[PDB]
Amino acid sequence: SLPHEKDKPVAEPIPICDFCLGTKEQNREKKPEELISCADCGRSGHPSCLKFSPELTVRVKALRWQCIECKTCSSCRDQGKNADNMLFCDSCDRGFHMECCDPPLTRMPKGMWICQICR
Amino acid sequence: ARTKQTARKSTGGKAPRKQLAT
Ligand SMILES: [Zn+2]
Ligand SMILES: [Zn+2]
Ligand SMILES: [Zn+2]
Ligand SMILES: [Zn+2]
């Protein structure tokens, strides 16, 4: 974890998937699947409804994971006017503004992208 | 790479508000 994520309180999780309305007992394939929940708003989703790979799912369960809308840049801690184009790491799902990457990026990377923390 | 925009399209968006959990 990052220092600013450590001991930063997490919201009460809602035990329903906001995408399919199932619980941990029933995803869209009518099979059990544990939810993941946003640390800031508490809303939840099945990893299969979020379209997360098994490997990404394992990693975000060990991190202070944020949903798409709550996601803040792991460098500058902001969302801001360029929020819609924040990159999401394909290893840890953290967000980074292109201009906050190391090195700063002028154009969107192509294909799978791994952030400066994971690379 | 994925962005906020592309991730939104991937989920298809939340279920309708009145059907969501309170
Ligand atoms: Zn679901
Ligand atoms: Zn959230
Ligand atoms: Zn930033
Ligand atoms: Zn990463």
Side-chain angles (χ1 to χ4, degrees), chain A residues 14-33:
Chain A
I14 303 307
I16 299 185
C17 179
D18 275 357
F19 303 95
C20 74
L21 307 175
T23 70
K24 68 186 185 181
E25 307 304 339
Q26 200 171 352
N27 64 12
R28 285 177 171 146
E29 297 177 353
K30 304 184 184 64
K31 299 182 179 68
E33 185 181 5

Side-chain angles (χ1 to χ4, degrees), chain A residues 45-79:
Chain A
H46 297 111
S48 59
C49 291
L50 292 163
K51 317 301 181 56
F52 284 3
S53 70
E55 292 78 7
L56 177 59
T57 297
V58 169
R59 184 57 174 150
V60 306
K61 288 178 173 175
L63 295 176
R64 195 185 181 280
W65 177 78
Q66 295 172 306
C67 73
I68 293 165
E69 302 311 323
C70 290
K71 193 89 72 192
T72 50
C73 177
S74 279
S75 180
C76 71
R77 308 279 165 190
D78 195 23
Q79 297 175 332

